[PDB]
UniProtKB/Swiss-Prot annotation, chain A:
Family to which the UniProt record says this protein belongs: Belongs to the proteasome subunit S5A family.
Domain notes: The 2 UIM motifs are involved in the binding to a multi-ubiquitin chain in a cooperative way.
VWFA domain location: 5-188
Keywords: Isopeptide bond, Phosphoprotein, Proteasome, Repeat, Ubl conjugation
Native organism: Homo sapiens
GO biological process: proteasome-mediated ubiquitin-dependent protein catabolic process
Superkingdom in the source lineage: Eukaryota
Keyword Phosphoprotein: yes
GO cellular component, one term: cytosol
Stated name of the protein: 26S proteasome non-ATPase regulatory subunit 4
Swiss-Prot record, chain B:
Protein origin, superkingdom: Eukaryota
Keywords, ordered alphabetically: Acetylation, Proteasome
Residue numbers of N6-acetyllysine PTMs: 295
A GO molecular-function annotation: structural molecule activity
One Pfam match: PSD13_N
Function: Component of the 26S proteasome, a multiprotein complex involved in the ATP-dependent degradation of ubiquitinated proteins. This complex plays a key role in the maintenance of protein homeostasis by removing misfolded or damaged proteins, which could impair cellular functions, and by removing proteins whose functions are no longer required. Therefore, the proteasome participates in numerous cellular processes, including cell cycle progression, apoptosis, or DNA damage repair.
PCI domain boundaries: 168-335
Any one GO CC term of the record: proteasome accessory complex
Descriptive protein name: 26S proteasome non-ATPase regulatory subunit 13
Similarity section: Belongs to the proteasome subunit S11 family.
Protein's GO biological process: meiosis I; proteasome-mediated ubiquitin-dependent protein catabolic process; ubiquitin-dependent protein catabolic process
SUPFAM superfamilies linked: Winged helix' DNA-binding domain
Species, as recorded: Homo sapiens
Swiss-Prot record, chain C:
Domain MPN: 5-140
Location in chain, cross-link Glycyl lysine isopeptide (Lys-Gly) (interchain with G-Cter in ubiquitin): 176
Family classification: Belongs to the peptidase M67A family.
Quaternary structure annotation from Swiss-Prot or TrEMBL: Component of the 19S proteasome regulatory particle complex. The 26S proteasome consists of a 20S core particle (CP) and two 19S regulatory subunits (RP). The regulatory particle is made of a lid composed of 9 subunits including PSMD7, a base containing 6 ATPases and few additional components. Within the complex, PSMD7 interacts with subunit PSMD4 through their respective MPN domain. Interacts with TRIM5.
GO molecular function: protein homodimerization activity
Protein name: 26S proteasome non-ATPase regulatory subunit 7
Full protein: residues contained: 5 to 195 of 324
Single GO cellular component term: nucleus
Functional summary from the UniProt entry: Component of the 26S proteasome, a multiprotein complex involved in the ATP-dependent degradation of ubiquitinated proteins. This complex plays a key role in the maintenance of protein homeostasis by removing misfolded or damaged proteins, which could impair cellular functions, and by removing proteins whose functions are no longer required. Therefore, the proteasome participates in numerous cellular processes, including cell cycle progression, apoptosis, or DNA damage repair.
Keyword set, alphabetical order: Acetylation, Isopeptide bond, Proteasome, Ubl conjugation
GO BP of this protein: proteasome-mediated ubiquitin-dependent protein catabolic process
Gene responsible for this protein: PSMD7
Other comments on record: Does not bind a metal ion.
Length: 191, 373, 191
């Protein structure tokens, strides 16, 4: 297995509540946290995958811990109403991942975004070259829907890393008739 | 049911600029921008026929959508009420949609404030107190919505118009003035509300420091195009007596609800003249003669005693008034609201205090200097 | 409606040795910790506390770190040494406040009837009083906004409980009880 502290965010903002694929998108984000947390449950029993939110604050609810079931109880009523922010999750994950173990793991991030998120072009290019300077490879995911011709997360993919990069890629999601395991199955390959 | 909007699709000219998109929204099956399409059918001037038919599909939303907050469902029944023009079926329908559409958010407050908003057809004072009171029973936790606090103002202001507390319109108008601070509608309607705000806070009296928040911008920007002496009579109760034409122009121009307690208004010119006369002169002779009182307070010698015993009932000044010399004695008072020129020129008391108690501290210590020991 | 507490500077010497930790661990300049204790009356006494490994971003200052490896199992320890001395609040240095103080208070407010952010003094040169308390307040305004929570000045002192002077008044070796009216009064006049 490849050494990283893959950080998962919950897309608990205002645009993960409709009934377009399944009658819920909580199933999409919730079973995606399920598959990634069971992958880091089976993968190595020394990781640290808890939670981070983007809605209005970065509330670290439980410990960034090896176990997962308390966090999988917290995914129930994840409360998707709030302000989505792509900038604060990666930054508080960077300091939380500087609050790590005897460090067996590097820094990886998946950021569930279901909105045309609020982050300047200067903000994304500074975040992305700070992760160049701070040695982080991020697997960038879109759930829900994002506005066509995406600007923020795709350019974070663009300027994210180098000198062993190969993490930064983005799947765009349309709001069509499909299913939720086919909205995690399109980003389960390449985050 | 797709055929329902296949037949109810065309709703005007240029209205299919959102209905040719609506015939693909539900194929995309989405409900965020379809909640916003309810809000946009509110935004575009619909004369209540697409919602008044799609209400059975709103029941269908409650059936098999079962995720979206019933914000738009309360919106859509209070926008079908233009087709309806009858609230008595809408009330049971709305509490039906309260108990059958689930969410984690604060829904009882939006439901009971919508019932308060469409309660105006009931003949109030019978159900208002109960469920309008239930709203603030469920307001303590988190008023994060705060348009529910605006509708709470509106039911509380029709509840003010349920007669009984005639300067609760001032505190309730603070609830209006801070329901949403940006006034989010044009100037004219709410500057007539500022007109009648001045009136409905003026004439009734539960408040006693009535000339207080006149400095607040969202009301004075409304007043700048009002009649040009309502501002000035509010200043005649802000400054407090010395605008004789204005503390009389309340008896000249503004006639409705005036003559019942303009005697109490001219009681408050005297209550406010007390704090005037003992504040604006900082100096002594705080055993003031009754003479300025009986001259400028439009009161008589036999009524200065009532003028200050009613102020003992008020409780902002509690003088030990002389009655062998008939002198109206000044004790402690409730001073002002704002003297920004004296907030700047209080240095002659503050820096006075600072450097002079400092210097006399240095002098006491300087005379007891070398017993430092 | 809280006036004063009783303060043992013993765990303020724990503030001192965590002020020794932060001078040699890293980028954390200020001493932020967690204040145990027990509401007894409007007067109160404190017997123990602890000091969180805390970081705080200079960018978007609402970035706290209060580990539950460091809270829950250390709370088990502090519960095992005594059931009485449980949580009562927390503490950070400076005199003023940083921004995240309100959320750090509301984190451990779920454990306590009134969690207190006693702002503490490590390098005392002040003109007024030492460390001072703040209680949970709902004062909101006369305007009627959503409910204010910025914890207002609901004061405190440094009270003295009992004996401890086996240590303390042997550790004096300098000071004297002034038979009041023997330039003690002009020490007070000066101050």
């Amino acid at each position: 297995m490849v050494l990283e502290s893959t950080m998962v965010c919950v897309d608990n903002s205002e645009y993960m509540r409709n009934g377009d694929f399944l009658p819920t998108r909580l199933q999409a984000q919730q079973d995606a946290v399920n598959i990634v947390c069971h992958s880091k449950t089976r993968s190595n029993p020394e990781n640290n995958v808890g939670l981070i939110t983007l809605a209005n604050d970065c509330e670290v609810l439980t410990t960034l811990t090896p176990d997962t079931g308390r966090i999988l109880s917290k995914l129930h009523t994840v409360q998707p109403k709030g302000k989505i922010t792509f900038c604060t999750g990666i930054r508080v994950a960077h300091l939380a991942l500087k609050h790590r173990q005897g460090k067996n793991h590097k820094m990886r991030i998946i950021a569930f975004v279901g909105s045309p998120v609020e982050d300047n072009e200067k903000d994304l290019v500074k975040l992305a070259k700070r992760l160049k300077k701070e040695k982080v490879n991020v697997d960038i995911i879109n759930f829900g829907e994002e506005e066509v011709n995406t600007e923020k997360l795709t350019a974070f993919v663009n300027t994210l890393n180098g000198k062993d990069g190969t993490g930064s890629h983005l799947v765009t999601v349309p709001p069509g008739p499909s299913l939720a395991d086919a909205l995690i199955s399109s980003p389960i390959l390449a985050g | 049911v797709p055929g329902f909007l296949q037949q109810s699709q065309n709703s005007g000219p240029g209205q299919p600029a959102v209905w040719h998109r609506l015939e693909e929204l539900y194929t995309k099956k989405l409900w965020h921008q379809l909640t916003l399409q309810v809000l946009d059918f509110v935004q575009d001037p619909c004369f209540a026929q697409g919602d008044g038919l799609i209400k059975l599909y709103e029941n269908f939303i409650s059936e098999f959508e079962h995720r979206v907050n019933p914000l738009s469902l309360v919106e859509i029944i209070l926008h079908v009420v233009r087709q309806m023009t009858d609230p008595n079926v809408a009330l049971t329908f709305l509490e039906k949609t309260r108990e059958k559409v689930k969410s984690s958010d604060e829904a009882v407050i939006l439901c009971k404030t919508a019932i308060g908003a469409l309660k105006l057809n009931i003949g109030d004072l019978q159900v208002t107190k109960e469920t309008i009171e239930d709203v603030e029973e469920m307001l303590n936790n988190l008023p994060g919505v705060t348009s529910v606090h605006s509708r709470f103002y509106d039911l509380s202001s029709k509840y003010y118009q349920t007669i009984g507390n005639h300067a609760s319109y001032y505190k309730d108008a603070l609830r209006f003035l801070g329901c949403v601070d940006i006034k989010d509608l044009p100037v004219s309607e709410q500057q007539e509300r500022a007109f009648t705000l001045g009136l409905a806070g003026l004439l009734g009296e539960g408040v006693f420091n009535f000339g207080e928040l006149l400095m607040h911008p969202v009301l004075e920007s409304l007043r700048n195009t009002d009649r040009q002496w309502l501002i000035d009579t509010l200043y005649a109760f802000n400054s407090g007596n010395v605008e004789r034409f204005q503390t009389l122009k309340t008896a000249w121009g503004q006639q409705p609800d005036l003559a019942a307690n303009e005697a109490q208004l001219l009681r408050k010119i005297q209550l406010l003249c007390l704090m005037e006369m003992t504040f604006t002169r900082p100096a002594n002779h705080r055993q003031l003669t009754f003479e300025e009182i009986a001259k400028s307070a439009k009161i008589t010698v036999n009524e200065v005693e009532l003028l200050v015993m009613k102020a003992l009932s008020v409780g902002l000044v509690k003088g030990s008034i002389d009655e062998v010399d008939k002198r109206v004695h000044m004790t402690w008072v409730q001073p002002r609201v704002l003297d920004l020129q004296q907030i700047k020129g209080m240095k002659d008391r503050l820096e006075f205090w600072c450097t002079d108690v400092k210097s006399m501290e240095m002098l006491v210590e300087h005379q007891a200097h070398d017993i430092l020991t | 409606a809280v006036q004063k507490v009783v303060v043992h500077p013993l765990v303020l010497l724990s503030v001192v040795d965590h002020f020794n930790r932060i001078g040699k661990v890293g980028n954390q300049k200020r001493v932020v910790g967690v204040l145990l204790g027990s509401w007894q009356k409007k007067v109160l006494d404190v017997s123990n506390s602890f000091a969180v490994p805390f970081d705080e971003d200079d960018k978007d200052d609402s970035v706290w770190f209060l580990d539950h490896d460091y809270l829950e199992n250390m709370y088990g320890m502090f519960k095992k040494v005594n059931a009485r001395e449980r949580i009562v609040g927390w503490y950070h240095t400076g005199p003023k406040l940083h921004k995240n103080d309100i959320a750090i208070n509301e984190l451990m407010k779920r454990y306590c009837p009134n969690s207190v952010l006693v702002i503490i003094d490590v390098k005392p040169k002040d003109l007024g009083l030492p460390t001072e308390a703040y209680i949970s307040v709902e004062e909101v305004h006369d305007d009627g906004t959503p409910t204010s929570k910025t914890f207002e000045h609901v004061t405190s002192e440094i009270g003295a409980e009992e004996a401890e002077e086996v240590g303390v008044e042997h550790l004096l070796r300098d000071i004297k009880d002034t038979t009041v009216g023997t330039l003690s009064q002009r020490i007070t006049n000066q101050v």
